[PDB]
Design an enzyme around this catalytic site. Structure first.
Site, PDB file in Angstrom:
ATOM      1  N   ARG A   1       5.753  -1.708  -2.697  1.00 27.98           N
ATOM      2  CA  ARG A   1       4.962  -2.418  -2.632  1.00 27.98           C
ATOM      3  C   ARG A   1       5.224  -3.764  -3.738  1.00 27.98           C
ATOM      4  O   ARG A   1       6.051  -3.056  -4.535  1.00 27.98           O
ATOM      5  CB  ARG A   1       3.435  -2.081  -3.020  1.00 27.98           C
ATOM      6  CG  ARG A   1       2.408  -1.573  -1.955  1.00 27.98           C
ATOM      7  CD  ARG A   1       1.097  -0.905  -1.576  1.00 27.98           C
ATOM      8  NE  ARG A   1       0.748  -1.404  -0.947  1.00 27.98           N
ATOM      9  CZ  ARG A   1       0.116  -2.392  -0.563  1.00 27.98           C
ATOM     10  NH1 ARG A   1      -0.209  -3.088  -1.192  1.00 27.98           N
ATOM     11  NH2 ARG A   1      -0.894  -2.771   0.691  1.00 27.98           N
TER      12      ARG A   1
ATOM     13  N   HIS B   1      -6.040  -4.369 -12.255  1.00 24.54           N
ATOM     14  CA  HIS B   1      -5.250  -4.373 -13.187  1.00 24.54           C
ATOM     15  C   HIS B   1      -4.674  -2.580 -13.018  1.00 24.54           C
ATOM     16  O   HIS B   1      -4.914  -1.852 -12.886  1.00 24.54           O
ATOM     17  CB  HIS B   1      -5.705  -3.782 -14.947  1.00 24.54           C
ATOM     18  CG  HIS B   1      -4.940  -4.113 -16.185  1.00 24.54           C
ATOM     19  ND1 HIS B   1      -3.349  -3.562 -15.757  1.00 24.54           N
ATOM     20  CD2 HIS B   1      -4.566  -4.455 -17.338  1.00 24.54           C
ATOM     21  CE1 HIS B   1      -3.085  -3.244 -17.079  1.00 24.54           C
ATOM     22  NE2 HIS B   1      -3.294  -4.187 -17.784  1.00 24.54           N
TER      23      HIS B   1
ATOM     24  N   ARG C   1      -0.256 -13.272  -5.644  1.00 23.78           N
ATOM     25  CA  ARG C   1       0.084 -13.327  -7.372  1.00 23.78           C
ATOM     26  C   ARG C   1       1.503 -13.139  -7.471  1.00 23.78           C
ATOM     27  O   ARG C   1       2.233 -13.086  -6.636  1.00 23.78           O
ATOM     28  CB  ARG C   1       0.436 -11.079  -7.048  1.00 23.78           C
ATOM     29  CG  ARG C   1      -0.507 -11.160  -5.329  1.00 23.78           C
ATOM     30  CD  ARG C   1      -0.503 -11.345  -4.191  1.00 23.78           C
ATOM     31  NE  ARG C   1      -1.010 -10.259  -3.443  1.00 23.78           N
ATOM     32  CZ  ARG C   1      -0.171  -9.048  -3.156  1.00 23.78           C
ATOM     33  NH1 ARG C   1       1.099  -8.616  -4.248  1.00 23.78           N
ATOM     34  NH2 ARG C   1      -0.819  -8.011  -2.812  1.00 23.78           N
TER      35      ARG C   1
ATOM     36  N   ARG D   1      -9.960  -6.881   2.377  1.00 23.86           N
ATOM     37  CA  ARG D   1      -7.925  -6.462   3.321  1.00 23.86           C
ATOM     38  C   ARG D   1      -7.551  -5.753   3.899  1.00 23.86           C
ATOM     39  O   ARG D   1      -7.928  -4.692   2.782  1.00 23.86           O
ATOM     40  CB  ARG D   1      -7.676  -7.411   1.963  1.00 23.86           C
ATOM     41  CG  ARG D   1      -6.199  -7.629   2.060  1.00 23.86           C
ATOM     42  CD  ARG D   1      -5.419  -8.059   0.974  1.00 23.86           C
ATOM     43  NE  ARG D   1      -4.390  -7.608   0.834  1.00 23.86           N
ATOM     44  CZ  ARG D   1      -3.523  -7.631   0.067  1.00 23.86           C
ATOM     45  NH1 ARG D   1      -3.385  -6.381  -1.244  1.00 23.86           N
ATOM     46  NH2 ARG D   1      -2.262  -8.050   0.001  1.00 23.86           N
TER      47      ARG D   1
ATOM     48  N   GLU E   1       3.176 -12.485   4.455  1.00 21.92           N
ATOM     49  CA  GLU E   1       4.789 -11.854   3.829  1.00 21.92           C
ATOM     50  C   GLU E   1       5.547 -11.675   4.209  1.00 21.92           C
ATOM     51  O   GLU E   1       5.990 -10.045   3.493  1.00 21.92           O
ATOM     52  CB  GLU E   1       3.155 -10.907   2.999  1.00 21.92           C
ATOM     53  CG  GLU E   1       3.658  -9.462   3.861  1.00 21.92           C
ATOM     54  CD  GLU E   1       1.778  -9.190   3.871  1.00 21.92           C
ATOM     55  OE1 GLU E   1       2.796  -7.850   3.012  1.00 21.92           O
ATOM     56  OE2 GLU E   1       0.694  -9.444   4.297  1.00 21.92           O
TER      57      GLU E   1
ATOM     58  N   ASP F   1       5.728 -10.855  -1.838  1.00 21.61           N
ATOM     59  CA  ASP F   1       5.764  -9.829  -0.597  1.00 21.61           C
ATOM     60  C   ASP F   1       7.127  -9.920  -0.170  1.00 21.61           C
ATOM     61  O   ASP F   1       8.057  -9.754  -0.287  1.00 21.61           O
ATOM     62  CB  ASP F   1       4.675  -9.688  -0.036  1.00 21.61           C
ATOM     63  CG  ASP F   1       4.736  -8.509  -0.643  1.00 21.61           C
ATOM     64  OD1 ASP F   1       2.580  -8.591  -0.827  1.00 21.61           O
ATOM     65  OD2 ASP F   1       4.284  -7.394  -0.054  1.00 21.61           O
TER      66      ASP F   1
END
Ligand SMILES: N[C@@H](CC(=O)O)C(=O)O
Ligand SMILES: N[C@@H](CC(=O)O)C(=O)O
Ligand SMILES: [Mn+2]
Ligand SMILES: [Mn+2]
Lengths: 873, 873
Positions: free
Chosen positions: A703, A135, A578, A393, A503, A540
């Site tokens: 980001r 979060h 996401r 990742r 992305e 992204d």
């Protein structure tokens, strides 16, 4: 209809106001009541009350700031809990009523040209894997999950009509206790959380909601299968698995070191031991059955052949207690050999448990077998030994540097200079080589050592702890081959799923080309054993090219990949990221999953559940059942009833839309000279970076998260709509509006894309947006603000015109309504947040001392606004 | 009205029948359905179906016996749980609705000639002490408390109207699970439980019901005080305390050795640590308040002055964890010094906890202070360090022998030969002596050593672990003085409350004389420090002289003692025993307490809650609130509004009644030549002795319990009614019926005495009684049976005539109804039990092997019948 919800919010607000009066003031309650009044007035056009609002805020002393902020934050908090209670209550929208599954199953069953066996195999092949994520605006130091389960239980009980006044009184007394706790129990991180802390919040979600939620989801799904179709899935089939990126994702995060992952890997095991002991204790006492099978008796044979099931549960109890002891030492930093009954695999828990189940069924104790044993059985396969597998990742670039430094040290050459055909050449040669490459006692740089140590943790960890290695920024076939080389060098005995993460618009565009080359390499093809997993970076790419181009780009890449792997015989698994329409939760989500290229979910559902949406999708056990049930119907329907292929003209409308939209989006974000300076002033972007919000350390630079979050706090929501409407108005201006309307009625991809703008336009707020410019932006940048705000006003009309409606998101009245509620509760936090940023930003300009009161009130608004807004990307 | 209860029993019975069909048979269900039918028929006069019943039972194979028995036992079990659920549910009799307290408080408050201060001091002086006792027919090896809390929770939830069908379905699925557990979870002691086991069941009652129950009782009582009277008792005043006789009572029980008590004393401490840790953990996390008082800050001063309340809870946590560790070693038999923070007194838990409360109130956090802290605060004083103080109990005779053997060894003389004036002489001399008497390394007999070792445990144990030393069979002043001498010799530093237990008509008769002599001894008077506690043995005196004589005897002895102590300035405390009208529970109990001689509860309520009634008075937390609330009103009313003194003529009616009744009772029990042989045949008395029922090892000989229990199983209930009615009919035959009717309307002692016969006559069953004679008694003893049964038929008429009613216990319709239900469910267990006793008794006569199936089915009936019958003495 929404009456009951309106009553509850009013009730919980009185209780809060009661508590605040008792607390410290009648003054703060006045601080709160004056700010809403003045804010409502100002908005409704009264320019005298806007002045009054501005003086009121400026006159707030620093000692008033936090309490005022927390108050506004708390009222919002009760509003969401009243909102979420209403959603699962049967006399409200009822999200967890098993008809959600049955409606889907009925549809299928009586659909001509759908053989029942076709349906049964789709059932038997279901697969869901939800990857939890941190979060970004978690402000307190201890998880509040468990208190929320409690406030909700209290509302549930007050819902009983005919409740004796004394019961009512009792319930209200605890409710006041519970609210008071929250007003007085203040915790505020002072420091940036750490990957362990974030890993810990995921354990809190697992125990306060997933632990009960999964097995219930599985019972309901099973009762429905048998009711509607005539059969129950076999006991050994648990189609859900939870995974976490916490302490696994180091993309962009120096604080997530190989040491941290090692640590977090251990901690998960410790916690599974903790939860599994509670299950096993229950079992040790309730399994007093003495009737057993030859096979089971054999399995114990004497010693405990006078209390058979209990025996096997007592053995497991010790075995769990032994491994617990061992991990608490390792957690502590002590090295000591591992006990004989150290648990490392799920098979070790499964086996004995399954043996008991079998005899109990065999010996006539079905009902007991299908009770708590069944629940533990399903939890072993859903959670098991590691509790929640993690995913590693790292960016592709980091692998190239590690392998470049290695090659130069060996005098072989410099990998980061070689063309791509040479890199693959070198990589295939070494991947087939039997002589090692990694120098035994080497001295690399910090960065390289980290890449090297992390693979050693992966390799060192028990098989099944790590779900996959994700490569963010994957651009070519050598990117994937690079991690297989490093893992080989790290000594790994099993086949680790590596997944490129495309992305960017071009990477998405090139994705198919990148994988067909990879599957044409015979060595690669036999290493993945008929399975590949790709990751689509919607969020992204949208930062790159805007949401329309990104969405169409992703549409095309999945279709190309689905087809490529089908030709080649590989089971493709699309790993979703996401936000986007797949992360909207609820019905939109179900619509969204079904709107993907045919084939899309043939290899399962694997998604990245956003951190800020966990409370709303898995916050209580009943919400988890809703969420998993929704997802489950989507898979089934999407696999037996795929969407139609687009009419060629549609494709050309989308190409064009994609170009116009990307063109306008980059126009502003990259080309416009005033944009960056505007951005930094109008949104709390810089502060989101300084403050102790996520575990990462304090436009192309940025980001997705911080791009999205910053615009969400300002209320303009720029990232999620920007060129879409502009492009759409232009195409209408060619008389193609009638085709856009056909695409919306008959093409799921398209209506779902337009649906999503509606919701963003539904939470955006142009009056608020304008207010931040007025308070935070320099006069010369006002024109840009006005321009972007006017772009939106015009984009809502085109969208409403294409949708043939006059009210935004009119097909989802409960979502519409709930967005209306939170918008009014969130209102005052945005009004206050502008003052904080002003006070904060001026202290700095005049080399002052970050006042802690001002900063903490700011963290409260940030977190409150983020909670009221939920998904905005 | 009772519709809802009738529905629930029917519902739970279907679920049981469902479970049994699945289980093993449709055959057993037929074994059960044929036996009820045939039994109902037979009773209703059909003598052909009586034959059929007799052949049916005789044809049951030994493999059918237990399952059939357990079935009948289970149906009864669901009936009681439906019965108990109905009692606390607000849409049923509602036992825990706080009006029970308020009705009492309103009455007082508006009663002229009752100053509010008179009321307030009575409030401030309340005192209740409930002494738990073992359950004589506890048949399983693990406590079932917790499962019962659960079945009840499930019924509570199914009571919600408007429950969404899916919720309903979910609830029913757990209900079926829970019932199945009970049908299959069979445990049956094979061996006699032990004092530790029985001590353990009391911990189970404490944690599954008293732990939540007490604090709730205290909140409700407090809310009512303030509502009705205008003030709340102070936080430091906790008027309830629980005590246990488990591992403390050795009267008649060789298995309760000083070693066992030592052990049990430790175990309690271990368990309090267990429960107190759960409370402290909660507190350690919820007390994040940082606002504290000078005094509190001082108390921590730095180190933890940045998390003050949390600090003090963390310190206590370690302190508890340390003592826990130490007792788990001692339990294990290891001796190792005690940690610095070993907990031994309640003050050690109180102190810190109270400090937090104070600051939270002072600093504005009232609501948080009055929540879980308040609950732990009250539990410390109610349960504390020892969890439940124990009471030691030994017969007087045993003390005389120990002190006789001692004196002969020293060559001083022989104490058990000296007259009573000499014994007191010797005892006062030694009690004042400074030179020891107990030989340092002596060799007594087993018995004496036990008496001596037990006092060493008392003395060795921390002060406040042991509540009192009870002397069963106390007949003279030297009996009390004897234990004070032994305790002195054992080395004791505090004043231990010694209490004579008068449990015979003459001892009751002589009781007052015995205590006035004791208070005339100046030495004794200053040793008890203004407080004496007497114990009234209702149940044993009634075994001696019958219930009427015993009751009047007890009436007179308390009045004499109350008056004696008042003259002398001693706070008398009457310790109540087993059964009698004070142990009826509920409303009768409240009537009963108020029907005691004025003064009676001035020094508090201290009662011996019978083992078999615990489930019914403290079985669930809500029942505990009912029970404590009922008791509380009784105390208050009894102390501000005492009953009238009897009209002299009444006293003479009672003298006479007492003589006629005792005369008839002894006529049969002692003088009749056929009685013992009858008794042993007609009741399962001998078997209750052999079977593994209580922890004591396998008419004057017998004890109250076995006298009462045996007659309860037979259904005649002889002990509880025998001469009463006979005496009453005779007095009516003198034309004094009109005085008996006045005594009933205006004398509480008398109506309460007649009330109690009604309930015994309500559960007795003459058809069943006759059936045991027919199956178990030799033909020549039939006439005695017929005579005793006819005595009862005639006694019900006289009682009904004096009560001016035609239906027994017509003033208590809910108790009447509930007795009607259980009587029908209990029916078949008595029918079956007669066959078991027959099979069992014939195996023996023909030197056979106690078949385990036959014995276990018998234990089931015994325990079922005892559960259906509840209080019968
Ligand atoms: N999750 C909703 C919006 C919300 O509830 O705030 C949607 O995706 O439309
Ligand atoms: N306890 C009740 C009888 C019963 O409920 O069985 C009474 O004393 O009258
Ligand atoms: Mn990225
Ligand atoms: Mn006795």
């Amino acid at each position: 209809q929404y009456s009951a919800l309106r009553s509850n919010v009013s009730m919980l607000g009185k209780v809060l106001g009661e508590t605040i009066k008792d607390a410290l003031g009648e003054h703060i309650l006045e601080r709160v009541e004056t700010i809403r009044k003045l804010s409502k007035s100002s908005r409704a056009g009264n320019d005298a009350n806007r002045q009054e609002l501005l003086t009121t805020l400026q006159n707030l002393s620093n000692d008033e700031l936090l309490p005022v902020a927390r108050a506004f934050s708390q009222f919002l908090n009760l509003a969401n809990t009243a909102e979420q209670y209403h959603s699962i209550s049967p006399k409200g929208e009822a999200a967890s009523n098993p008809e959600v599954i049955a409606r889907t199953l009925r549809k299928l069953k009586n659909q001509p040209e759908l053989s029942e066996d076709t349906i049964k195999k789709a059932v038997e092949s279901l697969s869901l894997e939800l990857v939890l994520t941190a979060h970004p605006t978690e402000i307190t130091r201890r998880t509040l999950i468990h208190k929320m389960v409690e406030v909700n239980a209290c509302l549930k009980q007050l819902d009983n009509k005919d409740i004796a006044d004394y019961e009512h009184n009792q319930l209200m007394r605890r409710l006041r206790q519970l609210i008071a706790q929250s007003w007085h129990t203040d915790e505020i991180r002072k420091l940036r959380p750490s990957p362990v802390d974030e890993a810990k919040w995921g354990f809190a979600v697992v125990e306060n909601s997933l632990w009960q939620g999964v097995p219930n989801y599985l019972r309901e799904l099973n009762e429905q299968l048998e009711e509607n179709l005539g059969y129950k899935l076999p006991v050994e089939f648990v189609p859900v698995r939870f995974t976490s990126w916490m302490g696994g994702d180091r993309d962009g995060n120096p604080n997530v070191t190989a040491d941290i992952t090692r640590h977090v890997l251990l901690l998960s095991r410790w916690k599974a031991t903790d939860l599994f002991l509670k299950d096993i204790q229950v079992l040790v006492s309730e399994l007093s059955m003495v009737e057993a099978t030859p096979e089971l008796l054999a399995l114990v044979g004497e010693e405990g052949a006078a209390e058979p099931y209990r025996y096997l549960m007592k053995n497991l109890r010790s075995r769990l207690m032994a491994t617990q002891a061992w991990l608490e030492a390792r957690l502590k930093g002590e090295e000591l050999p591992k006990p004989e009954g150290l648990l490392t695999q799920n098979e070790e828990l499964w086996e004995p448990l399954y043996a008991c189940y079998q005899s109990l069924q065999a010996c006539g104790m079905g009902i007991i077998a299908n009770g708590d044993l069944l629940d533990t059985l399903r939890r072993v396969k859903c959670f098991g030994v590691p509790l929640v597998r993690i995913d590693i990742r790292q960016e592709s670039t980091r692998h190239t540097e590690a392998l470049g430094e290695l090659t130069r040290y060996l005098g072989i050459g410099d990998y980061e200079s070689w063309s791509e055909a040479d890199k693959q050449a070198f990589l295939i040669r070494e991947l087939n080589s039997k002589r090692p490459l990694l120098p035994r006692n080497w001295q690399p740089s910090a960065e390289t050592r980290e890449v090297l140590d992390t693979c050693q943790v992966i390799a060192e960890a028990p098989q099944g702890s790590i779900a996959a290695y994700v490569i963010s920024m994957a651009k070519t076939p050598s990117d994937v081959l690079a991690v297989h080389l490093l893992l080989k060098e790290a000594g790994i005995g099993f086949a680790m799923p590596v997944a490129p993460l495309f992305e960017t618009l071009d990477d998405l565009n090139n994705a198919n080309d990148v994988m067909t080359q990879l599957l044409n390499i015979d060595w690669y093809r036999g290493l993945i054993q008929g399975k590949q997993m790709v990751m689509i970076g919607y969020s992204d790419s949208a930062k790159d090219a805007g949401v329309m181009a990104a969405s169409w780009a992703q549409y095309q890449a999945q279709d190309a990949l689905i087809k490529t792997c089908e030709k080649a015989g590989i089971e493709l698994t699309l790993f979703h990221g996401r936000g986007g329409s797949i992360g909207r939760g609820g019905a939109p989500a179900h619509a969204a999953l079904l709107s993907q290229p045919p084939g899309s979910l043939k290899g399962g559902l694997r998604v990245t559940e956003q951190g800020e949406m966990i409370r709303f999708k898995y916050g209580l056990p009943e919400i988890t059942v809703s969420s998993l049930s929704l997802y489950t119907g989507a898979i089934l329907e999407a696999n037996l009833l795929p969407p139609p292929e687009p009419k060629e003209s549609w494709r050309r409308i989308m190409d064009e839309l994609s170009v116009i939209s990307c063109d306008v989006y980059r126009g502003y974000v990259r080309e416009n000279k005033d944009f960056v300076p505007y951005f930094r002033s109008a949104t709390p972007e810089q502060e989101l970076g300084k403050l102790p919000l996520g575990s990462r350390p304090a436009v192309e630079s940025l980001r997705a998260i911080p791009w999205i979050f910053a615009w969400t706090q300002n209320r303009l929501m720029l990232p999620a709509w920007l060129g879409a409407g502009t492009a759409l108005q232009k195409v209408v201006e060619d008389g193609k509006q009638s085709e856009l309307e056909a695409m919306c009625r008959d093409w799921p991809f398209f209506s779902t894309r337009l649906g999503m703008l509606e919701m963003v336009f539904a939470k955006a707020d142009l009056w608020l947006a304008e207010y931040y410019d007025q308070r935070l932006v320099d006069k010369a940048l006002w024109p840009l603000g006005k321009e972007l705000r006017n772009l939106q006003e015009e984009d809502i009309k085109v969208v409403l015109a294409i949708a043939n409606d006059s009210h935004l998101m009119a097909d989802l009245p409960w979502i519409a309504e709930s967005i209306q509620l939170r918008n009014i509760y969130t209102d005052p936090l945005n009004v206050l947040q502008a003052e904080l940023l002003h006070r904060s930003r001026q202290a700095e300009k005049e080399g002052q001392e970050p006042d802690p009161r001002v900063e903490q009130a700011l963290m409260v608004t940030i977190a409150g606004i983020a909670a009221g807004m939920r998904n905005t990307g």
